[PDB]
Write a protein that binds this ligand. Structure first.
Ligand code: NAG
Ligand code: NAG
Ligand code: CA
Ligand code: CA
Ligand code: CA
Ligand code: CA
Ligand code: CA
Ligand code: CA
Ligand code: CA
Ligand code: CA
Ligand code: CA
Ligand code: CA
Ligand code: CA
Ligand code: CA
Ligand code: CL
Ligand code: ZN
Lengths: 49, 271, 132, 48, 266, 264
């Protein structure tokens, strides 16, 4: 019982694009290609979040 | 729009200043106090003859009067091919004049904002809300994903955040990516969602007196003075008009043809 | 060498002339504006000099690719040699000193002049391709 | 550029043409500048 | 670090607690807002820009004069919203001079010792409830020029009821100092360089700041912004929306251990 | 060297820099400080000029070179300002209501002018080019102008009826008038209390610097609206006591001088 809890604002998408593009340089190529052969299904992709 | 390949060895063409003066129109916008202080019914013809000495054919120069900055800001219609706005400086109206400059020194692509039924947000830094009218009192209520308001209740406008009161023109910039509920007096105001595309090159603003205070960009980190923002100290309006006439070539040099293909409805004074 | 090549040509054999700094590129200082306006304040394009054995090119963006799709602006220069060069040794360097200082450049039709005020950033994803 | 600077095997060319991951990883782990540069460009094109 | 400070950094041209934000605003701003929950709204709006919940902090100061009394810089990034008053120009400048730069200050005992300013980076910064700095330059014989070392009424006054004042006297000259030591304290400060983690946004007015005592230069750095305003809500909205640009002008690498506006050495 | 526009001077890009000449120029030059009467009023000391001279001596200037000239205010100072030192510094108090006048004063003392007399009673006058202005100085300078057409008849004014003329100055102490070039004008000025001169702006006056005390960048020493240059001889400071202003001027005198070039 209380005034309904407010779900706070998350992030404007431009900031997110900046952040993901900045993460893009942290990727290892051998390991990336090794990941790029595992058939990521729904379970596989949404279990590690 | 096609690629334009040019040679760096090409020869400069002769001065086109006379041709553009002959085939274009000039509009001068001045406050009513200018005509009051001048106190002469034939001053338009005197300035026209002086411009003719400068090269402009008779009738190409058009003189338009506005009561004051606040009144001029209500849908400023700029007619001629080249527009020069003589804006008197008032230390109390630094934002308002700036807003006016921001409205007329830039190209804006605007669409209607039907606030009473729709929820609006700003997508990027180029997006603003331009509201114009006799009295624009805008209150804003930021919202969240659950549609609730932040420090505001969508059902109680009294809690909406006040961003403008009794404004003839106001450019509202809010946080991007956030939906807001808007409450503005639609009877005496009209609010439009606008994107600034780029500079409007055929409009120059001459600030008569004061200091450089115009800020035509909402970004706090930039306060650029383009070549179309002039500033002249003054004590007599006749001197102001004489210096405008004498340096007309310099003023037009700082200006370029509009170049934009519009969709709006505005009359023009063209030759 | 020249009489040897003359005899080979007369016999219709393969000829060959060695050139140090061959004069293969006709002089041409030009530019192309892929984005332009009458006021020439937001310009995107590339300017080049092809002189003698030298090709300097410089791609410029006035907006610094802020509104570009991936914040990347792609520049391309194609120079067609009037004769086939073989066994060529070339030096490639990542800056064009010729187009790295401010200048005033006539417009394509000579109607006016625009201002160029370079600030040099390293070129990205450089690819030089020699085609036959 | 590879097959010129790096004379690649018949099997390696066969695999590279058909995007066989085995040859791709063997070349990447080899620290082959050409294929690593290509793959880095492909990764950098992954941009929101 | 210190053992590798005097070592080169070689780089190739062909190669290719989290942060906290403090907002210093005048109390009249909060009065104009008239809302008792505006801080939460601004915190969430910042969170849209990527600042976690408990990162942004809002510090209130009565006015420019009061804020200048030993200012404290708390967060990693310090954006100071300073209202412009044509009558307080110098004071504003002084605050900026004390806030946008790093200073190294030593105690000054004016009663027992004369003092001189060695170079152009040396100033005398005094802060407190009210300062009244009176200066008597001396000569090689230690006799006052236009002043009497015994008679303090002949001293030349350079400050009157100042909450903060940066005094610049002629270098290489000894000065006898009369300061209201009871109500304020003076220190011999040296300007080290810019303080990159503090930005100053002047709300309204024109560009009048002068953070350098030299008359020949009045540099406007990227950390000195100016905005026209009518409603404080618009001011805070433009501060929030362009927080990216504001932080870009700053560097997080100037936050000392303590919040003081000057390093202090005995 | 002097002003060698007439003849070329050839120099190598390898000639070793000579030592600092700051001490030598300080020894062999004079310095004038122009300050308003308010500064003297706030500085109640009667020997403050002597103290400033001593402080300058601590900075190198000999004890016969620093001079202090007092003017009542900008409007009065603008009446034929005479600057006779090798280096001139004008502490100019800022008032928002006199901006143009300030600018005019600066425009007159920060630039070199070649002036000729004017007889508004005898001849018509026109301004040939952008550098040509009409500088009027005196106790009260009221200037009215009537432009003339090619037939000598006035435009929007009657040459005989001065009341119909267009007013460009009223009760001014100094005013720079800029009219449309190529147009003859019939002028009407108070010759009793005003002298008007036909002047050409040759170039900057490099031995005169203006330190604007308080305010903002409002000086416009160019008639052209499109340009408001701020030269390195146009300084601005913030102030609350005049003693601090004078101490700042004394301490950074080397920087002020290097921003100026000696008298030719
Ligand atoms: C351009 O000007 C030159 C020199 O004034 C003149 O000879 C020429 O006829 C003019 N017109 C063209 C088209 O060159
Ligand atoms: C110039 O400076 C140098 C080095 O300080 C000194 O040795 C020399 O005597 C000075 N004077 C001249 C005329 O070179
Ligand atoms: Ca407004
Ligand atoms: Ca509320
Ligand atoms: Ca926005
Ligand atoms: Ca701005
Ligand atoms: Ca103070
Ligand atoms: Ca005294
Ligand atoms: Ca000092
Ligand atoms: Ca300064
Ligand atoms: Ca005047
Ligand atoms: Ca008349
Ligand atoms: Ca003129
Ligand atoms: Ca000007
Ligand atoms: Cl060679
Ligand atoms: Zn062009």
């Amino acid at each position: 019982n209380s005034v309904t809890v407010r779900q706070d604002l998350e992030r404007q998408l431009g900031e997110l694009r900046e952040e993901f593009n900045a993460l893009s340089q942290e990727i290892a190529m051998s390991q990336l290609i090794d990941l790029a052969l595992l058939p990521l299904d729904m379970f596989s992709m949404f279990s590690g979040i | 729009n096609l690629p334009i390949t040019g040679s760096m060895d090409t020869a400069y063409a002769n001065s086109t200043q006379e041709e553009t003066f002959l085939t274009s129109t000039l509009c001068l916008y001045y406050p009513t106090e200018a005509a009051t202080e001048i106190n002469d019914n034939s001053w338009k013809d005197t300035l026209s003859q002086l411009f003719l000495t400068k090269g402009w054919p008779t009738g190409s120069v058009y003189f338009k009067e506005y009561t004051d900055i606040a009144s001029f800001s209500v849908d400023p219609q700029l007619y001629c091919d080249y527009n020069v706005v003589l804006m008197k400086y008032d230390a109390t109206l630094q934002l308002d004049m700036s807003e006016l400059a921001d409205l007329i020194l830039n190209e804006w692509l605007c669409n209607p904002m039907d606030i009473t039924l729709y929820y609006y947000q700003q997508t990027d830094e180029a997006n603003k809300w331009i509201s114009m009218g006799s009295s624009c009192t805008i209150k804003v209520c930021p919202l969240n994903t659950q549609t609730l308001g932040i420090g505001c209740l969508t059902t109680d406008t009294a809690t909406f955040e006040e961003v403008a009161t009794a404004e003839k023109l106001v450019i509202t910039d809010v946080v991007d990516g956030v939906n807001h509920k808007l409450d503005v007096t639609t009877a005496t105001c009209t609010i439009r969602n606008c994107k600034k595309l780029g500079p409007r090159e055929n409009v120059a603003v001459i600030q008569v007196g004061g200091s450089d205070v115009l800020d035509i960009t909402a970004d706090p980190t930039t306060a650029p003075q383009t070549e179309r923002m002039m500033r002249i100290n003054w004590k007599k309006w006749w001197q102001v008009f004489y210096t405008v006439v004498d340096y007309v070539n310099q003023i037009i040099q700082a200006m370029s043809k509009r170049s934009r293909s519009l969709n709006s409805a505005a009359f023009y004074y063209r030759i | 060498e020249y009489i040897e090549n003359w005899n080979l040509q007369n016999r219709r054999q393969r000829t060959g002339f060695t050139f140090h700094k061959p004069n293969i590129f006709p002089y041409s200082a030009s530019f192309t504006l892929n984005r332009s306006q009458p006021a020439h304040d937001n310009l995107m394009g590339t300017m080049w000099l092809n002189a003698g054995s030298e090709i300097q090119v410089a791609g410029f963006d006035y907006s610094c690719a802020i509104n570009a799709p991936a914040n990347i602006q792609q520049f391309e220069h194609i120079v067609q040699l009037r004769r086939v060069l073989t066994t060529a040794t070339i030096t490639l360097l990542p800056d064009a000193e010729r187009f790295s200082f401010p200048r005033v450049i006539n417009s394509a039709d000579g109607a006016t002049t625009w201002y160029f005020n370079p600030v040099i950033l390293r070129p990205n994803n450089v690819e030089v391709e020699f085609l036959l | 550029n590879l097959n010129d600077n790096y004379g690649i095997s018949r099997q390696q060319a066969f695999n590279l043409l058909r995007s066989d991951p085995r040859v791709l990883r063997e070349f990447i782990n080899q620290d082959n500048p050409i294929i690593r540069n290509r793959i880095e460009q492909l990764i950098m094109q992954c941009r929101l």
